Amino acid sequence: NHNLHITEKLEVLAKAYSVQGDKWRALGYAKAINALKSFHKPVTSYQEACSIPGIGKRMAEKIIEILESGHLRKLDHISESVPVLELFSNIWGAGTKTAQMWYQQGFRSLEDIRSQASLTTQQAIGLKHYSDFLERMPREEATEIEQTVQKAAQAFNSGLLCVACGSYRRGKATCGDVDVLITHPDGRSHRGIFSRLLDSLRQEGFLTDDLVKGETKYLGVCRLPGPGRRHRRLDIIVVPYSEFACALLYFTGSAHFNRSMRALAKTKGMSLSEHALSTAVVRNTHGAKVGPGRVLPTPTEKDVFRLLGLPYREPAERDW
DNA sequence: CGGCAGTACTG
DNA sequence: CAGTACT
DNA sequence: GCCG
Ligand SMILES: O=C([O-])C(=O)[O-]
Ligand SMILES: [Mg+2]
Ligand code: NA
Ligand code: NA
Ligand code: NA
Ligand code: NA
């Protein structure tokens, strides 16, 4: 990154808009930041700033003030509430609206939340693990977690396929959580396995808390045995084999990469989800799907790329 | 002007 | 439904 | 916030 002197100032404003609920402006900042981090050289001119995709008049103006002034005046008028809103929205299950409500009600600390806030079941678990969920784990621990799930699943049916996705599959040295995708090549024996799989992982003591228990998605908390272990976020998704490639693609990410790929599909009259890539998709004038297209056959991730007219990208090159 | 990805889960 | 979360 |  040739422009840290810019981005680290911009990230502060981005975070402020985000925790305050200004989602679209924060998205604009996030895109301008990544564009700046991918630039090959320091941006040294206003029109050079305007050069880059994701940088407009407003953003170029801010970069010009930073190079001349070494500073961004807007940083000095960020509301005093933002550090507290960030503290609160780092509770799993509390977002901008809950954080703002707690702030309005006078709460200022996690002690205030603990002693006085009404918490959902999910939020109470997030608060209990507040520090642990802000920490990343070594890649090698994510391996142990994936393998724990795989062995529990394969105890029931040796034919079950289990793949760690997310940042793990993209090759990162540390992971904020573990994402495990499960399917069965026969296209049938994936059904109704959650109850037994989750029960098995609980009997161990491995699964410590459940955040979400849906028919296809589980989100929760695990901890490996022994001393020196922290609680870690674990997501599991079980999908039919017919959807494996799109589910693998979705779950491997990155989030930015998925959104960019899905935006591309839309421009070409298609739609991409975790379930399928569809074509001949009819939408209204607001980009809204009003008529469903046809599912396209996507036996492998490469097929999704190919049908989108894209060169194949290995997971490591999807880390956007 | 208005979209900015598409979906699952919770209560 | 609105809110939050996942990639 | 940016961009079509
Ligand atoms: O945890 C993550 O950030 C992921 O899965 O990409
Ligand atoms: Mg993940
Ligand atoms: Na530009
Ligand atoms: Na949160
Ligand atoms: Na009080
Ligand atoms: Na996850």
Tell whether A293 and A236 lie within a shared domain.
Answer: no
Question: Does residue A220 line the site of ligand 1, with CB under 6 A?
Answer: no
Per-residue tokens: A215: 């028919």
CATH code at A66?
1.10.150.110
d(CA A121, CA A109): 19
Q: What's A186's DSSP letter?
A: T
Provide the residue range defining the domain that includes A114.
81-134
Q: How far is the CA of A101 from the C1' of D2 (A)?
A: 30
What domain count does chain A have?
Answer: 4
d(CA A126, CA A309): 42
Among chain A residues 79-98, those with CB within 7 Å of any atom of strand C: 89, 91-98
Tell whether A168 and A219 lie within a shared domain.
Answer: yes
For ligand 1, atom 3: residue with the closest CA: A167
Q: Where are the alpha helices (DSSP H) in chain A?
A: 4-19, 23-37, 46-51, 57-69, 82-89, 96-104, 110-116, 121-128, 130-133, 139-156, 166-169, 194-203, 244-252, 255-267, 301-307
CATH code at A118?
1.10.150.20
Question: What approach was used to elucidate this structure?
Answer: X-ray
A191 in the Ramachandran plot: left (φ > 0), alpha (ψ -120 to 50) or beta?
A: beta
Tell me phi and psi for residue A159, to 5 degrees: -80, -5
Nearest ligand, CA of residue A59?
Answer: 3
Concatenated DSSP letters for A248-317? Answer: HHHHH--HHHHHHHHHHHHHTTEEE-SS-EEES-EE-TTS-EEE--EEPP-SSHHHHHHHTT-----GGG
Is A151 catalytic? The answer is no
Report whether A28 contacts A94 (CB < 8 A).
Answer: no
Q: How far is the CA of A73 from the C1' of C6 (A)?
A: 35
Q: How many CB atoms lie within 10 A of CB A195?
A: 9
Resolution in A: 1.9
Report whether A221 contacts A125 (CB < 8 A).
Answer: yes
CATH code at A302?
3.30.210.10
Q: What's A176's DSSP letter?
A: S
d(CA A307, CA A309): 5
* Secondary structure string (H, E, C) spanning A250-265: HHHCCHHHHHHHHHHH
**Which nt is closest to the CA of A261, judged by C1'?**
B5
Per-residue tokens: A302: 């490469």
Question: Does residue A254 line the site of ligand 1, with CB under 6 A?
Answer: yes
